[PDB]
């Protein structure tokens, strides 16, 4: 029935963007309720990046120093603290709009949707993977710092990333809504490269049975190897370690298909090293790692019996 | 050498006017603009009327309490109904809330839209894509996303251009504007119809070129430049659509923007059809991506929402 890259129905996080503003420097903020969340960083300028002592530049500022919009309307800030790397802003009044929602932090090669807002304003949306080295492949053309990133499973709403810096490598990286950082970063303007990235070798799995679910299975092949022995192979080709786990994972996958993990894993192998033959696999040329088991169960198999 | 994601609008405004509509024993979705709800007229059938209703009879069959409406658990009690095309209208006694401000439009092959895909009146994703030349969507369908709109939003207007009625053998969609009106030769009933052959999108291969070279990414670009025939006597061997001088015109202000003239980038991309990328990639990916227009591109590459 054809896929594509879903993304999360962004209008309960909308509700909640905001503008934060401090001296000449804006980003966004999440706004839950009477506290608002944003990058601690806000709070420096060309100077407080290459080496702030945030607990220093805090004391030095105050409630009047937030400028906090709700659109085209002031929201007054009567008391903040911090938590790691964001600020958590009181105000007067509380977000009719609060939705119900969680903090939950992600595991790397889990997926999410993040709102890519410029001055508290909702821009775009779209569907990303918390890459194996903790980054994300995103577009956060400068300005989106203050974004979030969530999931939507039913009426909750799961916040799991806020963006935080442009890398200079070219990613970005984030915290989890409560400062805590996605990685080996830190918000300070030095040079911090990102680690070496790995393909997600479980979402690649979901990904060929999906195609086969989808009436497409070119790839499929007679073969079936061991766990030892495909990592072997895959671990050459810069795939990441497919453990047990992940091939439980993959069982109910490997149910409605009829194609056992192992087996599905031969065919990778198969893949890996008799490159693509040029053929496609879901219209796609090369091997799509963004998918986890569960996107694909929540695209090719209804919603329902 | 960046970040830059295929991005869909946000969905709040279009979430927000969501119904499910319910005549029998079929139920679909619906759009709530004021007054109004318009959903696929083949909600009025079962399972082998489809073969070739009369509906503007069968519609007089139909009364206003045959039609359930809801909008979460709210009962919208339908008070009129008329057809319009391939188009349902039904008039609710209750004027919808959140209506934003809007227009219909009808969109040109190539160009590109937002799709909230829904589930008995519920939204459960969104993404992009574009209305592709043979008349199609390559989007994620399952069980009955009919009604699911498609559109675009600009500054705070929403212009809606497409609503899904069934799927095709080719494991694709088709629908009709706003008005009712298909898209393609499709028609609501069920014949042996299938797509015809689907071209690349060379308009848009193109705007993602000056993308690219936009975002710094110019390994591409070359010294020469070509005549409008012979780019496409020559693309038109690797299965892209025919350049016009009209799309041509339409890359300006991004031909503008770059320095770089429209005829050079095609003879930038006449090079890169016949010599392959040779692993050289562009804005990461290893494909040149169709589906990101000239407006996706000022849109993005340009801090607005």
Redesign the interface.
Same mark, same amino acid.
Request: charge should be positive; proline fraction near 4%; include cysteine.
């Given at each position: *029935?054809? %896929?594509?890259?879903?993304? %999360?129905? *962004?209008?309960?996080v909308?509700?909640c963007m905001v503008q934060v503003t401090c001296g000449t420097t804006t980003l966004n903020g999440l706004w839950l309720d009477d506290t608002v969340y944003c990058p601690r960083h806000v709070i420096c300028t060309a100077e407080d990046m290459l080496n702030p002592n945030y607990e220093d530049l805090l004391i030095r500022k105050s409630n009047h120093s937030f400028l906090v919009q709700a659109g085209n309307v002031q929201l007054r800030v009567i008391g903040h603290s911090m938590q790691n790397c964001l600020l958590r802003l009181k105000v007067d009044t509380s977000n009719p709009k609060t939705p119900k929602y969680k903090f939950v932090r992600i595991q790397p090669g889990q997926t999410f949707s993040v709102?890519?807002?410029?001055?508290g *304003?909702?821009?775009?949306?779209?569907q990303?993977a918390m890459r194996p080295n903790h980054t994300i492949?995103?577009? %956060?053309?400068?300005?989106s710092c203050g974004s979030v990133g969530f999931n939507i499973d039913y009426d909750c709403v799961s916040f799991c990333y806020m963006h935080h810096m442009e890398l200079p490598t070219?990613?970005?990286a984030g915290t989890d809504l409560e400062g805590k950082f996605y990685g080996p970063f830190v918000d300070r303007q030095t040079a911090q490269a990102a680690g070496t990235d790995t393909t997600i070798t479980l979402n690649v799995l979901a990904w060929l049975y999906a195609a086969v679910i989808?009436?497409d299975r070119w790839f499929l092949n007679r073969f079936t190897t061991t766990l030892n022995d495909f990592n072997l192979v895959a671990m050459k080709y810069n795939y990441e370690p497919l453990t047990q786990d992940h091939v439980d994972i993959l069982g109910p996958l490997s149910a409605q298909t009829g194609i056992a993990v192992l087996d599905m894993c031969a065919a990778l192998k198969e893949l890996l090293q008799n490159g693509m033959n040029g053929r496609t696999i879901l219209?796609s040329?090369?091997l799509e790692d963004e998918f986890t088991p569960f996107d694909v169960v929540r695209?090719?198999?209804?919603?329902?019996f």
């Open positions: *029935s054809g %896929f594509r890259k879903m993304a %999360f129905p *962004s209008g309960k909308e509700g709102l890519a807002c410029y001055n *304003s909702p821009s775009g949306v779209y990303c492949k995103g577009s %956060f053309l400068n300005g070219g990613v970005h989808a009436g219209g040329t090369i695209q090719c198999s209804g919603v329902t």
